[PDB]
Amino acid sequence: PVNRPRLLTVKHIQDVSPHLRRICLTSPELADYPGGAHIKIMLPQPGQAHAVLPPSQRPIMRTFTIRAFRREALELDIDFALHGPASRFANEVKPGDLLAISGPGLQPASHYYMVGDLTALPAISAMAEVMPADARGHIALLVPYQEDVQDLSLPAGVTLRWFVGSPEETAPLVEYFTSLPLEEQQSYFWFGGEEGLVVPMRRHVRRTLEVDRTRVYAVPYWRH
């Protein structure tokens, strides 16, 4: 069973940003683990010592991004957008703690248009690491604090602009992204994160432009 749930150990923790914590996880069971995919982390219910994997004892599940996966080092990285059960795991985390995770569930283009918040930053960073060096386009990020503006190495022709504001101030960013000229041929639209970012941009793209099913990734990561 190569997609089974696995119990992994926190190797080390790191705060790349004030509200972005990178937790490294390890286990010999990573050797046959199946780019930037999403997993479900499985947390114990209140009262349980640990997640009960396989029915009223089932764990609480949240969806997250595989930030990085190093098979040879038996290591898997998950970045937590600090702010629920997942947030209390991310705050109280200590090395040695258990986290159960599920199995996993970027397109070639000339133009990349992306928008996200801090819950979409790991997906964007992972995608940046394998982005084609000649890529063109624009990335817009809405962070809650000016001190979570952080460095993100990009291809030379991709633009990056930060927007500091609360999840409700989807207004400077959305205006700016609706203003920019967008290519509808040989392009990839990636919208992730909060409720009020994915959907304004997704109707913006299927209003002003004719692009196909396959080249619009608009997935709300949560709902305020």
- Could you tell me the CA-to-CA distances from 40 to 7, 107, 166, 218 in Å, in that order? 12, 23, 26, 19
Size of the site for a second copy (CB under 8 A): 23
Q: Is residue 72 involved in binding a second copy (CB under 8 A)?
A: yes
List 73, 88, 91, 224, residue binding a second copy (CB under 8 A): 73
Q: Residue 197 touches which of a second copy, ligand FAD, none (CB < 5 to 8 A by kind)? A: none
CB burial readout 95-127, b (16+ within 10 A) else e: eeebbbbbeeebeebebbbbbbbbbbbbbbbbb
Q: Is residue 214 involved in binding a second copy (CB under 8 A)?
A: yes
Q: Residue 200 touches which of ligand FAD, a second copy, none (CB < 5 to 8 A by kind)? A: none
**Least distance (Å) between residue 134 CB and a second copy:** 5
Q: Which is nearer to a second copy, 63 or 178 (CB)?
A: 63
Q: Which is nearer to ligand FAD, 113 or 190 (CB)?
A: 190
**Least distance (Å) between residue 156 CB and ligand FAD:** 26
Q: Which is nearer to ligand FAD, 9 or 145 (CB)?
A: 145
Q: Is residue 5 involved in binding a second copy (CB under 8 A)?
A: no
**Least distance (Å) between residue 176 CB and a second copy:** 24
Q: Residue 170 touches which of ligand FAD, a second copy, none (CB < 5 to 8 A by kind)? A: none
Q: Is residue 28 involved in binding a second copy (CB under 8 A)?
A: no
Q: Tell me the backbone φ, ψ of residue 208, rounded to 5 degrees.
A: -85, -5
**Least distance (Å) between residue 157 CB and ligand FAD:** 26
* CB atoms closer than 10 angstroms to residue 187: 20
- Could you tell me the CA-to-CA distances from 128 to 15, 163, 205 in Å, in that order? 20, 19, 22
Residues that bind ligand FAD (CB under 6 A): 38, 62-65, 79-81, 83-87, 119, 122, 219, 221-224
* CB atoms closer than 10 angstroms to residue 21: 18
Q: Residues for the chain: how many in total?
A: 224
Torsion region of 2: left, alpha or beta (phi above 0 gives left; psi -120 to 50 gives alpha): alpha
Q: Is-contact 66 57, C-beta < 8 A?
A: no
The Cα 61–Cα 45 span in angstroms is 10
Token output for 55:
């029915």
Q: Residue 85 touches which of a second copy, ligand FAD, none (CB < 5 to 8 A by kind)? A: ligand FAD
Q: Which is nearer to ligand FAD, 33 or 221 (CB)?
A: 221
